[PDB]
Amino acid sequence: MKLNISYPVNGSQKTFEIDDEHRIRVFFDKRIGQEVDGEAVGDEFKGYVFKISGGNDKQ
Amino acid sequence: QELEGLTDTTVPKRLGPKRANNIRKFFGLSKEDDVRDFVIRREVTKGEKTYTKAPKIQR
Amino acid sequence: ANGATSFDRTKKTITPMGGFVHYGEIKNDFIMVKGCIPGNRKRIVTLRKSLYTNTSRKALEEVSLKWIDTASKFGKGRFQTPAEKHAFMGTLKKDL
Amino acid sequence: MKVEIDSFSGAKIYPGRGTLFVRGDSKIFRFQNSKSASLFKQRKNPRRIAWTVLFRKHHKKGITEEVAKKRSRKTVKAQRPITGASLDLIKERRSLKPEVRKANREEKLKANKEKKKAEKAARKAE
Amino acid sequence: SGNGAQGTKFRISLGLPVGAIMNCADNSGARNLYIIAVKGSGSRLNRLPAASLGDMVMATVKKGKPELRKKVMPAIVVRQAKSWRRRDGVFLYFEDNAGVIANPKGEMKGSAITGPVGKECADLWPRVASNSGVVV
RNA sequence: GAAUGUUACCGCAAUAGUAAUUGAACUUAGUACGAGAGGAACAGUUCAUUCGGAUAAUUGGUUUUUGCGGCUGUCUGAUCAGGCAUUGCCGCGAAGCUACCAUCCGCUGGAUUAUGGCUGAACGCCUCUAAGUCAGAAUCCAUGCUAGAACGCGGUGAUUUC
RNA sequence: UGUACAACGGGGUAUUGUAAGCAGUAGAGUAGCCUUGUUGUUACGAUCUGCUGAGAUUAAGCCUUUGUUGUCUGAUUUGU
RNA sequence: GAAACUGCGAAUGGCUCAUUAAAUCAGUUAUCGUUUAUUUGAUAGUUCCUUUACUACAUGGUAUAACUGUGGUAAUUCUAGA
RNA sequence: AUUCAUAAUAACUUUUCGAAUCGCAUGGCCUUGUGCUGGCGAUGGUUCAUUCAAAUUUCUGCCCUAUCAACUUUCGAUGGUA
Ligand SMILES: [Mg+2]
Ligand SMILES: [Mg+2]
Ligand SMILES: [Mg+2]
Ligand SMILES: [Mg+2]
Ligand SMILES: [Mg+2]
Ligand SMILES: [Mg+2]
Ligand SMILES: [Mg+2]
Ligand SMILES: [Mg+2]
Ligand SMILES: [Mg+2]
Ligand SMILES: [Mg+2]
Ligand SMILES: [Mg+2]
C-alpha cells in the first residue's frame, strides 16, 4: 500500500510506496491511535515508531 | 538515521499570532510590553516595492 | 512442541487433551498424513513409498501447517491446553 | 486463523468447530456446539443459563479485571519557525523582553506627537 | 448453472430437490418459486435432481402476479437453509430457502434483493451480486 | 475343517476377478475461417457429474450411558431418597454406529482395430501390401488392486526320556 | 514372581447445569401478640440469594497411575 | 477585495386540484385557552458567591475554517492524515 | 366577569439575563497623565406592549343516494376525577 507519513515537529510529510507484504503485515489488526515500531516495516525506519492516525481503503 | 523528506527538511508555520494575549504568550513579554512592536511582519514584494503587511491586533 | 507450528508457537505435543480415544499418548515419532487411511485405531499399518512419480501440481505442493487441533476428542472439546482451560475458567473448588 | 466467540455462551470457537447461522435480518450467530445452538433455537435467555459468560458477568462470579487505562501526560514542548519570523528572531525577541525602556521612550515621543497634532488642528481652523 | 456462469463452484450440500418451494427474494412480483428442474444436474435412477446455493433452476411461480404464473422461468438460489461446509471449515446455513428470477444468461428480472445472499452465489452470478444488498 | 513327521514365523504366485466415468468454466480467442453475420480446436488451469473403496478430526442423525437436569399421576406418614406408569414424558447428552447430510483416495506401460503412412514389386509406370515396415481407439494384455490352489511351492525357528 | 496382570482407589478428559444442608434485613402477601415498631416479633409462604461452574456420572470398546488389596504349574494331545 | 467562518434568508413566491361531504370553506364569534423571529415604543446602578485575593476590567480562555502541504477513489457539491 | 394587572413573604434552579462588540467624529477640563470627561450612530439583550402572524374555537349554512335504519362503545365511543 501507501504510507502517508508526517513528522509534525518539522511539519514535514511524505508518502512511501511500500510492497513486500510481510513488512506491511505488522500494521494489520491495529487500531487508529495505536503505536507500531518502524523496524518491523523497514530497517530504513529502524528505531522509529509510528502512530496510526488514519487512512483510506480502496474505493 | 535521518529521512530525506521528513527529518532533514522543515517548513515554517504560515501565520503568527493575532490576538494580543496570544502574541504576549508566544513571546513571553510582560503585563505591559506594548505588543504592537512584537508583531510578525511578512515582507512581500509586489514589484520593486516591498511592504510588510502585519496583522491587525485583536482585543 | 510436536503439535506446535511456526504460527502457533505454544508448546504442546500432538496428543489431544485427555489422550487419543481408545489409543493413548504419542510419546514416539509419528507420521501425520492428510485425510483418512484404512484401518481403525490400534491397528498395525504399513506405509509404502509411491510406486510412480506423480507431479499433478498437487503432489508437488509444499505444505506448511498453521495450527494443529489438540482439543479433546472424547467430547465437544473447547480448550487446546490445560493452561488455556485454566485461564478461561479461573479458579475452581478443587484448585486451592 | 481467528478464534470466534459463541453468540450464546461466549465459548471460544476454533476453526471447523460448531456452526454458523444467518438470521433473516442478515445478523450472524456463531455456536461452539449443538447444545448452545439448540438453546438459542429454543429461545432461552443466555443471562438465565448458569454456565454462560453472560450469566457469570451479570452475577459477578469469578470476577476478573482487565482494567487498563493509558493516559499520556504529554506536553509537546516544541518550537518552530514562522514565515515572517525565523527561530533566531523569535529567540531574540523572547530574550529582550525584561526591562524594556522602549515602551517608555515610544510613549513619550508619541505623546509629543499627539500634542502637536491637536495644535495643528487648531491652527488649521484658524 | 451452465451458460452465464462466471467461474466454477465448489460442491455445496444439496438441500432443494424438485418439488421444493422457496421464497422469492427479489421484487419481480413473485412470492415463491416451485423448483421443477436443476440446470447441470446429473442422472441417476430414482434420484431427484436437487439444487444448492448458487444453482440455476427452472421454476414456476405458484403465488404472485398473474402474468408471472403458469409458465416456466429460470431462477437462481440465493439462500439455502440446509447446512453446508465451506473450505475454510464453517458449517453455515440461512433461516429460509430463497431464490430470484433470472433469464438463461443470468440477468435478474427484478432490480433489488431483500435479505442476505450467499457469497458463493454472489461470486458466480454478477448481476445477483450487483442487485444484492448484503453478502455473507 | 481331517489328512501331507509335529509346531511356529516369514514368503512366492498358478488360476480367477478387476474400474473408473462424463461435463462445465477460465485461457487459447472474439483468434483461425469468413464479404459479413457469425465463430472453433490442441496444449494449460480450476472445478463439477455418475460410479467405487475406505474413514469418523469436524458437522448432522441416532440414545437403555436410562449420564445429568426438568415435569405429571400415584405409592413409600413428612423431609431426604426412591418404586410403578410394558424405555412415563421433555431438554441436553459422551461413546459407538453412521450420511454426497460428512471427509479423504481412485496408477502408467506395451500390443493392436479402424484409419492414415514408408519402402516396394506384381504390372519397366503406379501403388499402405504381396515380402518387409511406421504411427495409431474409451479396445486387448500387462503394471497396479482383491483372493490365494483348503491334494501348488519356497525360506527359516524350535523340536519332548523317567 | 514382573517397565506382569487384575479389582478398587486417585488424577486427567468428557456430560449435565449449580447437589443435600445451613443461613438471609430477599420474597406477592395474609393472620396473632404486645413493651403498637420506625429490621417489632411470631407463624405460613411458590420462589430468590450465598456457600456452589457446585453435586452427580465418567468405560462398560476413554487416557493415566511410585497408592491399597490380591493372582500366577489345571486338563488333553502331538515324533521324521 | 476572492475564499472561508459568522449572521440572516432559503417556511415567501410559483405550481396543481389528487385527497377531502360538518371535513374544507363562507359570513359571524372566542382566547378570562396559548406560541410569536422581525418592526415599533418602553424597560435590568443590586453579578467580585465563605461574595478580604477567588478575581485582569486601560479588557481573561480554547479551538477551528479559509490557507500551506501530503493523499485516496472510475465516479458525487466525497473527503482523510499533518 | 377572574385565583386579573401588580405587589409582598419563605425558599427553590441542575441557574437565565443584566454589552469583554463595531464605524465615524474627535471636542472640552486641568493636579500635562496617553489623566478625567465627552457626541452621532451600528449590532446585541431581559421583560411588557405593539405589529406581522399562528394555533385552537362559537353559531348557521353543502350535491346525489333507504336496491344504506340503526350507528358508536373489545382496541375511546359519551361523561367524571387525577
Ligand atoms: Mg469423539
Ligand atoms: Mg423410480
Ligand atoms: Mg490375471
Ligand atoms: Mg459408505
Ligand atoms: Mg452430535
Ligand atoms: Mg454421536
Ligand atoms: Mg512411395
Ligand atoms: Mg443446594
Ligand atoms: Mg452455584
Ligand atoms: Mg502389590
Ligand atoms: Mg425592541
Residue type, position E109, single letter: K
Resolution in A: 2.4
How far, in Å, CA of C93 to CA of C40, rounded?
39
Task: Considering only the beta carbons, identify the residue of E89, E91, E116 that sits closest to D26.
Answer: E116
What 8-state DSSP symbol labels residue A9?
T
Residue E6, all three cell numbers: 462466471
- C16 within 8 A of C73, measured Cβ to Cβ: yes
Closest alpha carbon within chain B to A44 = B1
Residue E132, all three cell numbers: 444484492
Beta carbons of A11 and D78 less than 8 Å apart: no
Measured distance between the N- and C-terminal CA atoms of chain B, rounded to whole angstroms: 46
Per DSSP, the three-state class of D20 is strand
- E93 within 8 A of E65, measured Cβ to Cβ: no
How far, in Å, CA of D10 to CA of D51, rounded?
10
The count of residues in chain B is 59
- C16 within 8 A of C70, measured Cβ to Cβ: yes
Using DSSP bridges, classify how beta strands E32-38 and E21-24 pair: parallel, antiparallel or unpaired. antiparallel
How far, in Å, CA of E70 to CA of C91, rounded?
67
- A12 within 8 A of B10, measured Cβ to Cβ: yes
Beta carbons of D21 and E96 less than 8 Å apart: no
Measured distance between the N- and C-terminal CA atoms of chain C, rounded to whole angstroms: 29
Question: Between D87-96 and B20-27, two packed helices, what is the crossing angle to 10 degrees?
Answer: 90
DSSP H helical ranges for chain C: 82-89
Residue C19 backbone class (left: φ over 0; alpha: ψ -120 to 50; beta: rest)? left
Residue type, position E40, single letter: G
Compute CA distances E123 → B9, C85, E9, whole Å: 49, 40, 9
Q: Which nucleotides of strand F lie under 7 Å from a protein CB?
A: 23-26, 45-51, 53-61, 91-97, 100-105, 107-108, 143-144
Compute CA distances E15 → A21, D123, E20, E61, E98, whole Å: 41, 109, 9, 20, 12
How far, in Å, CA of E79 to CA of B29, rounded?
74
Using DSSP bridges, classify how beta strands E98-101 and E21-24 pair: parallel, antiparallel or unpaired. parallel
Interval between CA E52 and ligand 7 midpoint (Å): 62
Breaks in chain E after residues, C-to-N cutoff 2.5 Å: none
Per DSSP, the three-state class of D79 is coil
Measured distance between the N- and C-terminal CA atoms of chain A, rounded to whole angstroms: 13
E strand or H helix at D37: helix D34-41
Q: What is E15-136's CATH superfamily?
A: Ribosomal protein L14/L23 (2.40.150.20)
Q: How many CA atoms lie within 13 A of C45 on its CB side?
A: 12
The domain spans of chain E are 15-136
- D106 within 8 A of B36, measured Cβ to Cβ: no
Q: Does A have 3 or more CB contacts under 8 Å with C?
A: no
DSSP H helical ranges for D42-101: 53-58, 87-96
E strand or H helix at D112: helix D102-125
How far, in Å, CA of C71 to CA of D12, rounded?
12
Breaks in chain A after residues, C-to-N cutoff 2.5 Å: none
Short-list A40, A38, A4, A5, CA closest to A22: A40
Closest-lying nucleotide for E43 based on CA to C1' = F50
Is the C-alpha dihedral spanning E116, E117, E118, E122 positive or negative?
Answer: negative
Interface test with A, best of D1, D69, D71, D80 (most A CBs within 10 A): D80
Per DSSP, the three-state class of D53 is helix
What 8-state DSSP symbol labels residue E47?
P
Least Cα separation, residue C28 to chain D (angstroms) = 27
The count of residues in chain C is 96
Q: Which residues, in sequence order, are bridge partners of residue A14?
A: A5
Buried b (16+ CB within 10 A) or exposed e, D56-65: eeeeeeeeee
- Which residues have a Cβ under 8 Å from the Cβ of D64 and sit 6 or more positions away? C90
3-state secondary structure chain B: CCCCCCCCCCCCECCCCCEHHHHHHHHCCCCCCCHHHCCCCCCEECCCCEECCCCCCEC
- Which residues have a Cβ under 8 Å from the Cβ of C52 and sit 6 or more positions away? none
Beta strands in chain E (DSSP E): 16-17, 21-24, 32-38, 50-51, 56-61, 72-79, 84-85, 91-94, 98-101, 116-117, 134-135
